[PDB]
Every structure is written in C-alpha cells, then in structure tokens.
Symmetry: D2
C-alpha cells in the first residue's frame, strides 16, 4: 500500500488546503484585518508548495528514473518536461 499511503496523505493535505480557502472566505466575509488575511494566504500558498514538492519527488523517483532505463531520448523528454514544470512552480 505504498501508492495507497501516498494517495491518502495527498488527499488529507488537499482537504486541509480546501478548508483554508473556506477560512479565507469567512475572513473576507467578516472584514478581518487584511494583514491577517495575508498571513493565511501565505500559509495556504506554502501548503500547496509543500504538496507540489512531494509530487515532484515521487515523479522524479518513478517516472524520470524509469525513462533512464528506456534511453536517452526518453530521459531528455522527461527532464525537459519536469524542468518546465519546476520553472512554473518557481514563479
């Protein structure tokens, strides 16, 4: 249940993030001080970044590694794709 382990934890992290977004809506609805709203926006963006890093790690480990066993063209295509994805996350 290695897949099943990672999946259940991904879904738990995402459920937590989804509640944070509902929290933000409540904050706006109540006119909570903007700095406090920003603090929660940052906590949410950070939880998403942390989720992205776990996905990246699993991707590199399985997908990108498996391409190395197939050949050069395959690994180049996978690394090019992962690198574009990391570039998007960087912004």
């Amino acid at each position: 249940h290695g897949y099943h382990k990672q999946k259940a934890e991904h879904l738990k992290r995402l459920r937590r993030i989804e509640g944070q977004i509902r929290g933000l809506q409540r904050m706006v609805d109540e006119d909570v001080y903007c700095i406090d709203i920003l603090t929660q926006v940052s906590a949410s963006t950070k939880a998403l970044q942390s989720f992205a890093l776990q996905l990246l790690e699993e991707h590199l480990r399985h997908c990108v590694a498996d391409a190395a066993l197939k050949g050069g063209t395959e690994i180049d295509a996978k690394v090019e794709e992962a690198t574009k994805a990391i570039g998007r996350l960087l912004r």
Copy 2:
C-alpha cells in the same frame, strides 16, 4: 459600493480557488499524470498570489496611508507590519 465591489470580487476569486482545490483532489483520486497535477497546483498558487496582491494594494492605499496622516510612529509600525507580510508572501 466601493467596499462592496472589492468584497464581492474577492469572494468570487476565492470561490474559484476553492473549486481548483477540489479539482486537485479529483486529479489525485483518478491518478492523473503528476505533471498535469503540478500545472494545476501552480495555477492555484498563482491565483492566490494574485489575490494577495489585490489585498496588499487596498491595504497600502487605506491603512498605510491613513497612518501617515496620524504620525511617524504610526506609519513606521504599519510599514514594518506590511513589509513582514510581504516577506512571508515572497517565500
């Protein structure tokens, strides 16, 4: 309805972000290719960043400006706080 305008649009943006997070859960549930999941994580983090910038703009315009009219100590405290908040968003 200037407050009411900004509020309604903040809530619309947040409702959109909340659906994106439910989208991510569906992607994980269906084992969508990880790069595609990352693309959506990045779109969500970016929508949150864009929301944060709008809040910051409104904060600077009203709160931080109003402190300038009160005095030096007041503006220093507000600018110190906004700058810490921006530092958190930067990460």
Copy 3:
C-alpha cells in the same frame, strides 16, 4: 546620517552579493557538484530578496507616506507602482 547609514549598509550587502556571484563563477570553473552550486545560487537570490525588502520598507515609509499628505490621486499612483514592483519581486 540616517540616509548615510542605510546607504553604506545597502552598498555592503551588494558588495557581498557581488562576491557570491564571483564565487559561482569559480564553482562552475572548477566543476563543483551542481547541487552545491544551487545552494549558493539560492543563498544569492535570497540575499537579493532581503535587500529588496529593505528598499521596499524605506520606499513605503518615505515615498508612499509623503504621497498620502499630497492627496488621493498621488497616493493611488504611488501604491499602484509599488504593488506592480512587488508583483515582479514575487515571481
């Protein structure tokens, strides 16, 4: 010497960053392990971000505050500009 204090420290921070970039060139010239090069790239990007936050703080405190005393149009223009600049730093 409040201006003179901040100026001298800005220049010291920048001189330190400039040496870090020369360090990176030496690392590449010697074929240092790429992860170690990345660690130094990150330290440099972070020192630049930290410099950017100090500038932002001083800008908000003087420029953006002084605009509040002038009027609404003036503060809106200053806040719009600062917010675009922060958006650029965010990426």
Copy 4:
C-alpha cells in the same frame, strides 16, 4: 564540446549577473529612485533563477539518471537531494 558549450554559457550568464550587481551599486551610489532599483533587483533574481533551472536540468539528466542505472537506494538518495535543493530555490 557539450560540457564545454554549457560551461562557457554558464560563465557568460554569470558574468552578465555580476555586471547587474555592479549596476545596482551604481544605482544606490547615485540615489536612483527605489522602484527603479527594485526593477533591477528583480531582473537579477530572475537571471539567477533561470541559471538555476539550467543547472537543474543538466543535473537531472546526468546525475539523477545515472543513479537509476545503479539502483533504488542510489536513485532515492539523488532524488531526495534534488528535491531539497528545489525546495530551497522555491523560497
């Protein structure tokens, strides 16, 4: 000269970044408007990020791939390291 190609371009990019940092020092020395200084800070941080992505791509392609051919423990160690490095760049 594939190594030699990448090396020469890495060094050219870094020489360009080093001049940008000297540019920043001139800006501060002349008391250039802070927003303009920020614009250059952002251009420099972005050039460094772009350099980091090229290094990452080359690292993944050679180092991380070569570890896949060695075995599981080797690839896990390499992916763990690359992922920590990407986490540092993300901030």
